[PDB]
Each structure stands twice: as C-alpha cells, then as structure tokens.
C-alpha cells in the first residue's frame, strides 16, 4: 500500500509511541505523523502536536475505498488527507505544518498479522485454486486486492493463540500445561457467532474475559476498546494491560 512510501508513516506504532516521537521532534504546533490504525481495518491514525498536547484522529477506509476522519470530506489516500489539512484546518485542531519523519533506516512497524499476511494469501490461493508454478503466481497477483479483507477477517484461525471451539475447562487444561508464565494466553470461540473468550494466566490462575461482536460487527471485552479483528485485539493487549489484570505475553501453543 502507498502509505509505506510516506517518510512520516510509522506503521503499526501505538499512540504512546506516536506521542514519544512527537516529543522527540520538539512537539511544535502542527508537527504530525501518520500511523496504521490498530483497531480499524484498512484505517490510519493522524497524530498532531498543538498547545504542547497530542491530538489523535482515526482515518477510516470508507466502503468505496476512500479515506475520512469522522465528520470530514473523503480523500483518495491518507497522503491526500494530510496534504489537504496542510492548506485548510477544516475542523482539525490546527494546520498540519511539518511532518515528523521516521529517522533514516527505521522502518514502519508491522505486527504479527502483517508479517504473516503474504503467506496467508499464498496458502489460501494454493488451497482454493489448486494451481502451481507461474499460473499460481498470476492468480495470487490477480486476486490479492480482492482477498485482502477476507484474509484479514479469517487470519486469526491460522495464528498460534487461536484454539477454535474448545470449552472453558479444555482452555484451563491447555494453559496450565508447562511453564506458568504470567500473561500466557489463548482465545477460544464460544458460539461461532462472533463470541469468544480471552484466557489469560495470572499468578497460576486462568482468567476468562468475554469478547462479543456488537451490531456494527466490532469485537470488544465489555466497556473495552473496539476492534474489527481478533488479531488487532491481541496486538493491543500484548502492548498494554488496558484493564486486563496484566499484558498478554506468550501464546499458548495448540496441543
């Protein structure tokens, strides 16, 4: 995607990391960077310094493939949105004055999903199309953009922490095998209805947090941050407890 070519795109960094970068850059009015949304699929976040405070905007990908902040006009790309807001404030806290660029040789951050994504597309096309050699390579190239959203919404099935439809009791048994590492975790399906449980090891005891799909199709622990995908939810709670008794550490391997 074209936002990797932007010098001020930091990839999958957290809000806190974005704020750390803005302070490193002087926290000057209209200093800004771009990052990948950690809870909106296909989305970005704009992080802007003004009045020595950080202001964070989600840039959502619309159904039609344009990009908009809530209450804003649509743009062809995050780059076009940033260029636009360098000319007109149009409800933003201030004008975008100066990009904060990644220091040279520092790459955009990728999560586990981002690192696996090409292999998941390849495996899916091999399995559905049953092609080999150049014919397989062409089918991959042709279908990649059509398949991105399908692979993003089903990629959790192929991730080491996802154990599918197992009981509460089975999930306790699997987590309590081996080293009782704090933060050891898995996710299980409850309903095959968009209902799941996060099973987390805390001081030798297995805690169960419910995950539900709301009417928008967003996943959350009740009163928690909302995500489009389970892999987003795991990446989030692997960085910060954010209301869990502790941060997620080692995935419980399937047995």
């Amino acid at each position: 995607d074209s936002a990797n070519h932007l010098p001020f795109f930091f990839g999958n960094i957290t809000r806190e990391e974005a704020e750390d970068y803005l302070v490193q850059g002087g926290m000057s009015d209209g200093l800004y960077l771009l990052r990948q949304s950690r809870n909106y699929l296909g989305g970005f976040a704009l992080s802007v310094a003004h009045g020595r405070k950080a202001h964070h905007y989600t840039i959502e990908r619309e159904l039609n493939g344009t990009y908009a902040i809530a209450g804003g006009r649509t743009h062809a790309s995050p780059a076009d949105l940033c260029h636009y807001h360098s000319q007109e404030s149009d409800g933003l806290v201030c004008l975008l004055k100066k990009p904060f660029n990644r220091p040279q040789g520092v790459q955009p951050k990728t999560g586990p999903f981002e690192d696996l994504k090409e292999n998941l597309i390849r495996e899916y096309v091999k399995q559905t199309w049953n092609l080999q050699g150049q014919a397989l390579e062409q089918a991959i190239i042709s279908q990649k953009p059509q398949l991105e959203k399908l692979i993003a919404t089903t990629a959790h099935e192929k991730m080491p922490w996802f154990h599918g439809k197992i009981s509460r009791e089975e999930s306790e048994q699997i987590v309590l095998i081996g080293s009782k590492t704090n933060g050891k975790f898995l996710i299980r399906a409850r309903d095959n209805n968009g209902s799941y449980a996060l099973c987390l090891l805390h001081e030798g005891k297995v805690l169960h947090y419910r995950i539900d799909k709301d009417k928008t199709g967003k996943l959350s622990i009740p009163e928690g941050k909302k995500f489009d995908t389970l892999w987003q939810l795991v990446e989030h709670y692997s960085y910060k407890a954010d209301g869990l008794l502790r941060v997620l550490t080692v995935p419980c391997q399937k047995i």
Partner: peptide, 17 residues
C-alpha cells in the same frame, strides 16, 4: 465466572464533527 476490565476505555479520538 468472567473477569471484567478494571477500567473503561478512556482515550478519546478527536473528530472533524
């Protein structure tokens, strides 16, 4: 028994509304 979050999500995003 399900455990609940020890805090509601409290970070705001700004909008252009």
């Amino acid at each position: 028994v399900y455990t609940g979050l020890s805090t509601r999500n409290q970070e705001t995003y700004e909008t252009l509304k």
